[PDB]
Design a protein around this ligand. Structure first.
Ligand SMILES: NC(=O)c1ccc[n+]([C@@H]2O[C@H](COP(=O)(O)O)[C@@H](O)[C@H]2O)c1
Length: 313
């Protein structure tokens, strides 16, 4: 029979192979192998872990189903604050924002444009490549420690390929179809439906039973880090590419605009494409691309002066 010695080694092989397939399937939204290939290897791993429960590790794909049930969430401080964003609602506000930026910097500036995802803001801390803390934004300086729930979100890596220590921030949301499916299930069980995917994601992440959260099919998009110390990026667009390179799911609709006019074109392009996406967006976020310039602009008490969120009506 398969010995513990042989299983210990085989278990790691399976975790690596299965995690790579999951990265392709959930993070790149582009699987390489047919589902049956993954399922077969997954079953082999489950059999090994069942025979030797000591070989179960936090980065094993079998742990995505959750199991822990908490009494409540511990406070999760953000020593590096999670700021909000100033809002814009008209072409005027956007060009005015550009005027203020040029006034302060003294030259034209490039802008990294991204879609504003309507979900729950999250901060993911990794130490030596290992996922150690998942937290909600809360009030900006203190959120809720929802690490166990986030372990079930399939697109969240449990172990990065490189043992880097960083804290990434983004949005955890519920895709349109998943939101539709969930409300139908609630109607079937006589429960109150969620008013929108935003509330569905928030309500899901507030669940104390991780097994329930694991079935809610939440997804993620990461767009920044709390401390750029371990990162090599010097611009926001570079940061998005680097986040992708280290293993996080990033939104593919971002664009680097060299002028405010290009920025407005972007806003118009995605405004008309708004309902064609598998997820809901409440606008567009415009950020001064160069970190050196973001630094020069600084932050107000509530948000950075180097970014503005154009909110859809
Ligand atoms: N083809 C692939 O690489 C791949 C990777 C992860 C999950 N899946 C599929 O996703 C579904 C859920 O599986 P997991 O809950 O283990 O993520 C299954 O139907 C599975 O086959 C496919």
């Amino acid at each position: 029979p398969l010995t513990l010695t042989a299983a210990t080694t085989r278990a790691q092989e399976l975790r690596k192979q299965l995690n790579q397939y999951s990265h392709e399937y959930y993070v790149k939204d582009q699987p390489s192998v047919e589902d049956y290939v993954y399922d077969r290897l997954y079953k082999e791993l489950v059999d090994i872990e069942t025979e030797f429960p000591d070989l179960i590790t936090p980065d094993s794909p079998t742990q995505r189903v959750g199991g822990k049930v908490l009494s409540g969430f511990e406070k999760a401080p953000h020593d590096i604050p999670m700021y909000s964003l100033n809002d814009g609602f008209s072409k005027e506000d956007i060009f005015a924002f550009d005027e203020r930026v040029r006034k302060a910097i003294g030259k034209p500036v490039a802008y990294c444009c991204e879609l504003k995802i309507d979900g729950l803001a999250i901060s993911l801390r990794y130490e030596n490549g290992v996922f150690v803390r998942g937290a909600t934004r809360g009030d900006g300086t203190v959120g809720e420690n929802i690490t166990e729930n986030l372990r079930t979100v399939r697109s969240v890596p449990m172990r990065l390929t490189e043992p880097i220590s960083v804290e990434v921030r983004g949005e955890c949301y519920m895709p349109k179809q998943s939101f539709v499916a969930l409300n139908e299930e609630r109607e079937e069980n006589g429960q109150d439906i969620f008013a929108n995917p935003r509330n569905a994601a928030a309500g899901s992440l507030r669940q104390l039973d991780t097994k329930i959260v694991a079935k809610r099919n939440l997804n993620t998009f990461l767009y920044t880090v709390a401390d750029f110390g371990p990162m090599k990026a010097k611009t926001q667009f570079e940061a998005l590419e680097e986040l992708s390179a280290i293993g996080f799911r990033t939104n593919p609709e971002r664009q680097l605009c060299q002028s405010i006019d290009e920025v407005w074109a972007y806003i118009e392009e995605y405004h008309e494409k708004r309902s064609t996406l598998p997820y809901e967006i409440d606008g567009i976020v415009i950020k001064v691309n160069e970190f050196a310039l973001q630094d020069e602009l600084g932050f107000t008490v509530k948000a950075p002066r180097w970014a503005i969120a154009y909110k859809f009506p």
